[PDB]
């Protein structure tokens, strides 16, 4: 029949350019953030002040999240003043809407080794910390209690089983966190909340921005990986705890 | 002993049905997912020779991210985001099919189903509902089946109605998993509730005459989804059984 | 005080049971005024109203009330004529007022036609033989639309007949309600109870015509009692 | 530190109990001012107010407060007169203020008539014998309305009688709340109870409608025996509410 | 590989535990500035501020924050002075800023009085003895309000005392939250952990007066250990 049908049929008769297809898919794949863009942004706008500012912003992200106004009305006076000051200074937003967009949580994810260290030190101040986690498992790794830990899970220099175990241990926290903050998820299967965070996690782990060798070294320094390159008992127990539901 | 309007209602109900005009009305009014010819014509007329490549990029986007252009554009590589925005403005791509003229990436993908499905098979690990999800339900779920375009490739002719039924069930396994995995509305949703969420686009795609049945059959045989005898492969059969079994 | 005194005395009055019953009926739920719809259609469309109405009813049966959404998802000719008719008759998608003209209200305004057309168009219905055959043998196709409630007689047949027919139809109403909108049987029954009782109890469509029609379609026998298929369908709903 | 000192000194004050109870009573939940409603109706309608009010109450009992919406789905005559009365008395669909006159408030202002009418019009009620009979046999029809709380006596009967009546009525309040409030069908017994607790106790403890008349009326309808204790239907309904 | 180097180096910095803790405290949840509330009340109301504040607190205890909705649902006199006070002090129904003055914040600014009044007004509380007796015998009435958290001392008593008191009170917080907030024990615990700890860890209201007050009310023994009612309530909270 139509000319248009012949075109569709012929279109499906073309050879696939595999390399170019893979390139397109990678170009279009889920990306949580562009860390390099964010760091460039911070360093260029804040000057030498950018480190201090960034640390404070990260403390805010860790303890209160992205809701700048709503919290700011809800803290100490100096804290509020400074939070708003940083807000105007850096063009902070409460919601991640664009590739250029800078949220506090994105800042925290942009500097994961610092953020996770700070989170461990400020465990008692976390929205989902030891209070929630010790109930599920004994001695959950404090470095794991934040959105940035995904960036520190290595895909190289370790076995695939190690990577998997770490991802499950972290998945315990991701699940509990998602449930504790989302309206949507009060009663939901392990699998849907898992689906609510699968893309950011796989993207975070597979990202090439933060070097794997540094990840491995850092995990070893915190005792989350042994000197042998396999997960600590806390990691294994947490992983088992996530698998069991 | 009845009112004027009542008499009119009764007389109206005493008329003979013109069966042919009725079937015609039903067909005119029946569900139609898209006009592929309209989409292709618009794309080709707007893009000229670049329309082929551009379309391929758009289809990769549809396969991996869906229709939500802006939101997804915020969560991807720089090159991808750039070309995506460029193509949207260039072709007037929209995120929702609200009109027959609305051009969504998914409608584009569905307009070129053999290519879309081949690309889907090639881009297996990048799909939202792919081998990771499918392997848990069944062994070797056909990768060409893992996309919204496969429905258009199911033949109603050149095969038994049983073959068609089987293929539709095998594909329904993927449709079920996909619907549950992306359509947040479908929480706690029964097998039948989610089935009904895709019953119409699927039946419309299969019975559609835009894409010729013989080509469908030939293509399915070439991809080994149909055997040389014209019946579903063992993998297709297992997928169908897996769907019937829940 | 004096206001308490007035309240008490007010409560000392005898109830006028019949005047009360009329007030209740006047104020009771009413899905539509069929005479109003038909009159408006005829006045607006002129002689063309018959053809237009039949087309509109086919749309109501197969796609429902959502004109814009459906017009985006149908053939060109279908969409064009649908939008044209919307403009022509001022069709709306939701009934908010007594004057609101939705496709479903039209279909319900011409129930003997609508149910006949629905039977002829079994395969195009959202909830048809595919769904019904799973539940029961030989479900009457005329029952498979929103218009059938109006054809259930309250007179010229026993009340057991009326109840039975209402249960048989309740099977379809149940399935339809679930597929177009998991709640209890009674909850969903409650989702359609009022439009149904209103449709059955309406005096617009004459009972004798209803019974004659049901007889002609073999839903009631020459004897005036439900067919075997009707009895079984009713049992199928009583039985959940 | 001066503010802290002030805070401490404030908490070192002696409590004036009568002053506190006065404030609490002044601030406690109040569903409506019936005298206000009746006075407004009578002053506005004149001699016609009785007829008008009865029609309004039938509307409240059968359709609720949504005047325009309901006028959309009713007979022509019903719609015409409903809108006419709405216009005439300045009826509103929602109680935002003490002066707001809603149909349900009108019904609650004249509870003995409202409840008698509800019993007579049981088959027309949104939550009537169809629903209630499933839970209990012969649930008192006078209880099947928003006005019955006002008819439960706090005087002239035992405290146990009052409690029993309140539980029996709570069966209907529970069912009603569940059928009309969209939110509450996945809501526990206690959760739905808390949704109507305050209006109910305000209705029972209210002093507008005299207790002796309540008792006499309940006796006349056989909800109370000649002995002043709840009938078997009331007792069974109460048990049914306690049992969930 | 230029930005990555910066990212790694940033994570190679030393943590300043003290400045970090300082940032955390600065950014942590804080329910109110009692000094600002009291200063505004006293300066606006003059000699009258005491009368006003008490009335406002009774309103907070019995009705909460929703002034406009509640004013339509109370006695005429109550509604009138409530509206008058509302305008007089610029009272609002929701705390959006440190300057927002809600009735509940007023109540929490004067916790020893509020808790005393709450005990005296036991029968008028939304979650009072009726609810509490079902969970435990002799639950302390001073605990049946949002202000009690501020009176739990962190000093001048053993750390064990603080634990039992906070758990005993957590029982009321649980019941209250369930009754008004719109569901496991720990999940709802998370709904009130931050305000509870902020109230308990805040230093505006001196610990020695807290302890003294608790002794006077018999929640603490003469030696400074929890009453039997407190421990039984605590056990009752930890159990399920």
Curated annotation (Swiss-Prot), chain A:
Homodimer. Homohexamer; ring-shaped, necessary to form the nucleocapsid. Homopentamers; opened pentamers in solution. Binds to viral genomic RNA. Interacts with glycoprotein Gn; this interaction allows packaging of nucleocapsids into virions. This is Nucleoprotein. The N-terminus is involved in homooligomerization. InterPro entries: Capsid_Phlebovir/Tenuivir, Nucleocapsid_Phlebovirus. Keywords: Capsid protein, Host cytoplasm, Host Golgi apparatus, Host nucleus, Ribonucleoprotein, RNA-binding, Viral nucleoprotein, Virion. It is found in: Virion; Host cytoplasm; Host nucleus; Host endoplasmic reticulum-Golgi intermediate compartment. RNA binds at residues 30, 67, 106, 186, 196. Binds suramin, which inhibits the replication of SFTSV in vitro. It comes from the Viruses. It comes from Dabie bandavirus. GO terms for cellular component: host cell endoplasmic reticulum-Golgi intermediate compartment; host cell Golgi apparatus; host cell nucleus; ribonucleoprotein complex; viral nucleocapsid. One of its GO terms (molecular function) is RNA binding. Its main location: virion. The keyword RNA-binding applies. Belongs to the phlebovirus nucleocapsid protein family. The record marks 64, 67, 70, 95, 106, 184 as: RNA-binding.
Swiss-Prot record, chain B:
The keyword Secreted does not apply. It comes from the Viruses. Pfam families: Tenui_N. Belongs to the phlebovirus nucleocapsid protein family. The N-terminus is involved in homooligomerization. Encapsidates the genomic RNA, protecting it from nucleases. Displays high affinity for single-stranded nucleic acid. The encapsidated genomic RNA is termed the nucleocapsid (NC) or ribonucleoprotein. The ribonucleoprotein has a non-helical structure. Serves as template for viral transcription and replication. After replication, the nucleocapsid is recruited to the host Golgi apparatus by glycoprotein Gn for packaging into virus particles. This is Nucleoprotein. It comes from Dabie bandavirus.
UniProtKB/Swiss-Prot annotation, chain C:
The keyword Cytoplasm does not apply. The N-terminus is involved in homooligomerization. It holds the Pfam family Tenui_N. It is found in: Virion; Host cytoplasm; Host nucleus; Host endoplasmic reticulum-Golgi intermediate compartment. Belongs to the phlebovirus nucleocapsid protein family. The record marks 63, 66, 69, 94, 105 as: RNA-binding. RNA binds at residues 29, 66, 105, 191. This is Nucleoprotein. Homodimer. Homohexamer; ring-shaped, necessary to form the nucleocapsid. Homopentamers; opened pentamers in solution. Binds to viral genomic RNA. Interacts with glycoprotein Gn; this interaction allows packaging of nucleocapsids into virions. Encapsidates the genomic RNA, protecting it from nucleases. Displays high affinity for single-stranded nucleic acid. The encapsidated genomic RNA is termed the nucleocapsid (NC) or ribonucleoprotein. The ribonucleoprotein has a non-helical structure. Serves as template for viral transcription and replication. After replication, the nucleocapsid is recruited to the host Golgi apparatus by glycoprotein Gn for packaging into virus particles.
From Swiss-Prot, chain E:
Homodimer. Homohexamer; ring-shaped, necessary to form the nucleocapsid. Homopentamers; opened pentamers in solution. Binds to viral genomic RNA. Interacts with glycoprotein Gn; this interaction allows packaging of nucleocapsids into virions. This is Nucleoprotein. Encapsidates the genomic RNA, protecting it from nucleases. Displays high affinity for single-stranded nucleic acid. The encapsidated genomic RNA is termed the nucleocapsid (NC) or ribonucleoprotein. The ribonucleoprotein has a non-helical structure. Serves as template for viral transcription and replication. After replication, the nucleocapsid is recruited to the host Golgi apparatus by glycoprotein Gn for packaging into virus particles. InterPro entries: Capsid_Phlebovir/Tenuivir, Nucleocapsid_Phlebovirus. It is found in: Virion; Host cytoplasm; Host nucleus; Host endoplasmic reticulum-Golgi intermediate compartment. The keyword RNA-binding applies. GO terms for cellular component: host cell endoplasmic reticulum-Golgi intermediate compartment; host cell Golgi apparatus; host cell nucleus; ribonucleoprotein complex; viral nucleocapsid. The lineage of its organism: Viruses, Riboviria, Orthornavirae, Negarnaviricota, Polyploviricotina. Disulfide bonds: none annotated. It comes from Dabie bandavirus.
């Amino acid at each position: 029949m139509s000319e248009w049908s012949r075109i569709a049929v012929e279109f499906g008769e073309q050879q696939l350019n595999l390399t170019e297809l893979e390139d397109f898919a990678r170009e279009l794949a889920y990306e949580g953030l562009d860390p390099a863009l964010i760091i460039k942004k911070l360093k260029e706008t804040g000057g030498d002040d950018w480190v201090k500012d960034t640390k404070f912003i990260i403390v805010f992200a860790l303890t209160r999240g992205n809701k700048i106004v709503k919290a700011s009305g809800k803290m100490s006076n100096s804290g509020s003043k400074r939070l708003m000051a940083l807000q105007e200074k850096y063009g902070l937003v409460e919601r991640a809407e664009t590739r250029l967009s800078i949220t506090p949580v994105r800042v925290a994810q942009s500097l994961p080794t610092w953020t996770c260290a700070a989170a461990a030190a400020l465990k008692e101040y976390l929205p989902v910390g030891p209070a929630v986690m010790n109930l599920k498992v004994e001695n959950y790794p404090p470095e794991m209690m934040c959105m940035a830990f995904g960036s520190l899970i290595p895909t190289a220099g370790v076995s695939e089983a190690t990577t998997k175990t770490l991802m499950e241990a972290y998945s315990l926290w991701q699940d509990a966190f998602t449930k504790t903050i989302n309206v949507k998820m009060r009663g939901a299967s392990k699998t849907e909340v898992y689906n609510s965070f699968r893309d950011p996690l796989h993207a975070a782990v597979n990202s090439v921005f933060f070097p794997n060798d540094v990840r491995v070294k850092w995990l070893k320094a915190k005792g989350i990986l042994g000197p042998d390159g396999v997960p600590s008992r806390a990691a294994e127990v947490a992983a088992a705890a996530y698998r069991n539901l």
